[PDB]
Amino acid sequence: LVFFAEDVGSNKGAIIGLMVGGVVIA
Amino acid sequence: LVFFAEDVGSNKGAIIGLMVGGVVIA
Amino acid sequence: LVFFAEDVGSNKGAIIGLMVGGVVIA
Amino acid sequence: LVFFAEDVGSNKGAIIGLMVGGVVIA
Amino acid sequence: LVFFAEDVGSNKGAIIGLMVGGVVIA
């Protein structure tokens, strides 16, 4: 499993909700 | 299980929400 | 396994929520 | 088996919340 | 099973909340 979450935001501001879900159950 | 995400945005602002569903149930 | 998460924000500001959920239950 | 969570915040300011949960149950 | 979590902040801090939770159970 190779997760790759790249966010390139040039001048975010306002309301920006960054949610990273990384749960594992084995 | 490759999950490549390359979001490229210039001047986001406003109302934005990022969600990365990375749940593994084994 | 691998879980990359990069957030490139050029001049964030405002309201920014970062939720990194990294739980490994084995 | 790696967990990368980097946030390149250039000139944040304002309201910026950060919540990273690093759980490793084995 | 490494964790590379970091938040680069170049200028501008204002109200910021850096909440990290490390739970290494082996």
Side-chain angles (χ1 to χ4, degrees):
Chain A
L1 311 62
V2 168
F3 232 125
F4 251 89
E6 215 194 284
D7 185 51
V8 186
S10 231
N11 224 103
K12 286 147 156 189
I15 293 90
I16 166 167
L18 212 125
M19 270 233 204
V20 163
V23 190
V24 181
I25 294 171
Chain B
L1 254 116
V2 173
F3 214 139
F4 237 106
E6 191 157 21
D7 173 277
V8 195
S10 251
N11 234 81
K12 298 164 150 184
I15 332 304
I16 194 270
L18 206 132
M19 248 222 290
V20 166
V23 176
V24 183
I25 312 289
Chain C
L1 291 279
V2 198
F3 189 97
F4 254 76
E6 183 223 47
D7 184 27
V8 185
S10 257
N11 215 347
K12 279 199 250 202
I15 295 133
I16 144 68
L18 234 116
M19 223 142 140
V20 149
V23 327
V24 164
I25 283 154
Chain D
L1 308 115
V2 314
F3 232 104
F4 258 85
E6 75 187 299
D7 169 7
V8 180
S10 172
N11 298 81
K12 292 138 132 153
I15 306 100
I16 191 300
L18 230 151
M19 231 189 161
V20 35
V23 212
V24 169
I25 280 163
Chain E
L1 294 121
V2 315
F3 250 78
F4 257 63
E6 78 233 77
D7 175 68
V8 177
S10 89
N11 208 15
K12 260 185 139 130
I15 309 128
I16 185 277
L18 199 332
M19 288 163 232
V20 37
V23 191
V24 170
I25 299 168

